């Protein structure tokens, strides 16, 4: 069963500019 | 306590404004009122005025904010911006630009105006004409603030870039005059934004911008010389590219009018150290395919003996070799024979580079190897009569 289990597993820019200005 | 409370309020504001039925959606209710012919115009004016206060209020909180609450205001802001159409948004926002007394809110307000036109088309042509005039009028007022002056220039750059030709000519000419004056601004930010507008404005106007040509090219060349001196400038790379893109733009739009100053263009390309070689080489491919080769060959001799021969700069020498070889493989047979005395005069100078060259043997041999191939290529595509005297 463990062998089967292994087989199972195998198969906004305006916001950013706004935030950047706040850092300034 | 209060921080947790305000977080919940802006969440509560966010839920109502969220566009999760005609009755529930605020956005649909607004447009219906606009669509109604019977709806009182004064009621419409109230909606415009109410939005401007609403838009200013949210921007005030975002300006004066907390990471999560910062994000929530943006969801609120995103909902707000979509409440009303582009037509009324511009009407309800442009007056607020002058009304607003805070530089931040004005800085924020300019950005959103550009975003509203990012996704618009031909239907906004009357609106953008109104926007351009307002942006033009506010700039003398906003000269004090670099950030506001920079952004307003760039929003115009976006609007001129997009359906700029369809814009009325007076605004386009007015913008070019305004951008040209601010090329002399001491702030590097204003220069680069000023340079960008001229490119788009010259692109739209084409030959009609020739009237401003004495005010564009000569100052730009002087700016480049100052650009080399101030190597401590943090925006040296962007500025140097900004000068290069200016020449590249007009090399496609006004080739014939630039040939007289083509030498200074080449000087900018050769010695623009900050700019990447790919940009510099790419603009060279523009010169060859747009400007007459015969004028180019004449200039290569002058620039070589003046600067490149004594430059002792690998990039400048190599890129000069790129210009020379490209021209010969594209120059016509008739043009080839006519410009023979100049090339050979240059060719003798190229052999004698070893005497003055400060580089090592391997470079000079490689440089000579290129020179020989080009010299063979050019002597081919010629006739005996022209070559016998030169030999």
């Amino acid at each position: 069963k463990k062998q089967v289990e292994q087989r199972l597993e195998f198969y906004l820019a305006i916001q950013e500019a706004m935030e950047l200005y706040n850092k300034d | 306590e209060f921080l947790t409370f305000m977080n919940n309020t802006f969440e509560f504001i966010n839920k109502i404004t969220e566009e999760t039925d005609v009755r529930r959606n605020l956005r649909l209710k607004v447009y219906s009122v606009l669509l109604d012919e019977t709806s009182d115009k004064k009621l419409i004016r109230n909606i415009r005025e109410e939005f401007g206060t609403l838009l200013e209020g949210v921007l005030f909180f975002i300006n004066s904010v907390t990471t999560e609450i910062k994000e929530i205001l943006f969801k609120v802001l995103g909902n707000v911006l979509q409440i009303l159409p582009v037509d009324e948004f511009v009407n309800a926002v442009l007056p607020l630009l002058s009304t607003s007394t805070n530089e931040d809110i004005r800085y924020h307000l300019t950005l959103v105006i550009g975003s509203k036109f990012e996704l618009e088309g031909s239907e906004a042509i009357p609106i953008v004409n109104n926007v351009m005039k307002v942006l033009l009028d506010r700039m003398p007022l906003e000269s004090k603030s670099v950030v506001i002056s920079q952004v307003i220039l760039n929003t115009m750059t976006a609007l001129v870039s997009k359906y700029g030709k369809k814009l009325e000519g007076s605004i386009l000419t007015q913008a070019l005059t305004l951008a040209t004056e601010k090329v002399s601004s001491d702030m590097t930010e204003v220069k680069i934004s000023s340079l960008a507008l001229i490119t788009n404005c010259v692109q739209v106007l084409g030959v009609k911008s020739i009237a401003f040509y004495p005010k564009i090219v000569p100052p730009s060349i002087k700016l480049f010389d100052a650009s080399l001196a101030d190597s401590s400038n943090p925006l040296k790379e962007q500025l140097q590219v900004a000068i290069l893109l200016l020449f590249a733009g007009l090399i496609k739009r006004i080739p014939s009018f630039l040939m007289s100053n083509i030498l200074d263009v080449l000087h900018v390309i050769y010695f623009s150290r900050e700019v990447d070689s790919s940009i510099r080489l790419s603009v060279i491919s523009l010169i060859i395919e747009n400007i007459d080769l015969k004028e180019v060959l004449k200039v290569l001799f002058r620039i070589w003996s003046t600067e490149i021969a004594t430059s002792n700069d690998t990039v400048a020498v190599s890129l000069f070799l790129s210009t020379l070889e490209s021209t010969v493989e594209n120059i016509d047979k008739k043009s080839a024979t006519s410009q023979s005395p100049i090339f050979f005069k240059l060719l003798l100078s190229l052999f004698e580079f070893r005497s003055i060259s400060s580089f090592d043997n391997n470079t000079i041999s490689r440089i000579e190897a290129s020179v020989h191939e080009i010299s063979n290529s050019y002597v081919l595509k010629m006739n005996d009569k022209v070559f016998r005297p030169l030999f």
């Binding site: - | 009237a211 040509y213 014939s256 040939m259």
Partner: protein, 35 residues
């Protein structure tokens, strides 16, 4: 307008080229009607 201020002899002449070339076609057609 043909701008002559702060422009070399060549650039002015290119201004004359674009104007004169465009006007030639209409000028020739008007001549044909008159003849």
């Amino acid at each position: 307008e043909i701008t002559v201020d702060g422009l070399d002899a060549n650039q002015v002449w290119w201004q004359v080229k674009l104007v004169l070339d465009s006007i030639d076609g209409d000028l020739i057609q008007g001549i044909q009607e008159l003849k």
